[PDB]
Amino acid sequence: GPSGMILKRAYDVTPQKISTDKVRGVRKRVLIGLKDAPNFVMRLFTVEPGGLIDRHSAPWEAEIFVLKGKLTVLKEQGEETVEEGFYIFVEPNEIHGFRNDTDSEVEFLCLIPKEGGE
Amino acid sequence: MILKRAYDVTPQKISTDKVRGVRKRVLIGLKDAPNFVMRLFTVEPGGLIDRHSAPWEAEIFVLKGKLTVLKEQGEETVEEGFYIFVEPNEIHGFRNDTDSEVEFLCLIPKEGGE
Ligand SMILES: [Cu+2]
Numbered sequence: 115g116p117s118g119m120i121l122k123r124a125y126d127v128t129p130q131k132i133s134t135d136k137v138r139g140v141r142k143r144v145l146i147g148l149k150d151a152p153n154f155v156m157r158l159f160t161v162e163p164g165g166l167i168d169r170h171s172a173p174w175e176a177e178i179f180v181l182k183g184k185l186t187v188l189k190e191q192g193e194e195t196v197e198e199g200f201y202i203f204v205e206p207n208e209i210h211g212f213r214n215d216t217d218s219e220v221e222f223l224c225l226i227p228k229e230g231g232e
Numbered sequence: 233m234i235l236k237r238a239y240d241v242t243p244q245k246i247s248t249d250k251v252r253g254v255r256k257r258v259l260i261g262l263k264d265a266p267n268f269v270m271r272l273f274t275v276e277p278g279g280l281i282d283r284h285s286a287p288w289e290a291e292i293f294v295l296k297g298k299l300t301v302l303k304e305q306g307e308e309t310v311e312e313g314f315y316i317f318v319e320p321n322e323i324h325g326f327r328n329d330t331d332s333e334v335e336f337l338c339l340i341p342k343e344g345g346e
C-alpha cells in the first residue's frame with residue numbers, strides 16, 4: 115500500500131449519529147477506517163447521557179480503551195462499571211453492550227478487525 | 233470478557249541501544265488476541281524510541297502529554313487527543329522533550345508480536 119504517516123486530532127472528525135435498532139444516544143468518529151486500514155479499524159465512540167448500545171454479539175472481537183467518563187458495561191450476566199483508563203477485550207461471539215448512566219459524555223476507542231467494517 | 237484498569241498491568245522497562253526511558257504495558261496480548269494487540273507506552277522525560285521501521289502498520293492514540301514523532305526526515309510534535317496511523321514500512325520513532333510522562337496507546341497486527 116501507500117507510504118507515510120497520518121497524524122490528526124481525533125476531534126477534527128465530526129461525530130456522526132449512530133441510530134439502529136440496538137443503539138441510541140451514540141455518535142462515532144472513524145479515525146482509521148477501511149480506506150486506510152490494512153488489518154483493523156480505529157473508531158472513537160461518544161455515548162451521550164442515557165445513551166445505550168444494547169446487548170448483542172458479533173462474530174469478531176473488539177478491543178476497547180475508555181478515554182473519558184464512567185461507562186456501564188452490559189455482560190451476559192449482569193453489568194460492571196469501568197472508567198477512563200480501563201481497557202476491555204470482547205471475545206468473538208461474547209454478549210456485550212454499554213450504557214451511560216451519568217449526566218456527561220463517555221468516550222471510548224473501539225477497534226475491530228476490518229472484516230467487521232468501520 | 234476482560235475489563236481492567238490499564239495502570240494495573242505491570243509495565244516493562246525498556247533500556248537498549250535503540251529504546252531508553254520507556255515502559256510498555258501489554259494490555260491485550262498474544263494469548264488473547266485473534267488478530268491485533270493493544271499496548272500502552274509511557275515515555276519518561278527525555279525518553280526515546282529511535283527511528284525504525286516494521287513490515288506491519290501501527291495505530292496509535294496519544295493519551296497524555298506532548299509526543300514528538302520522528303519521521304524519515306524531521307519530526308512533528310502532537311499531543312493528547314491525536315491519533316497516528318503509521319503505514320507499513322514507514323520510518324518512525326518517538327521522543328519526549330517535556331518534563332512530564334507521555335503516554336500513548338499502540339496497536340499492531342499480532343505478527344508484530346506483543
Ligand atoms: Cu458490539
Ligand SMILES: [Cu+2]
Pocket residue numbers: 284285286290324
Ligand atoms: Cu515501531
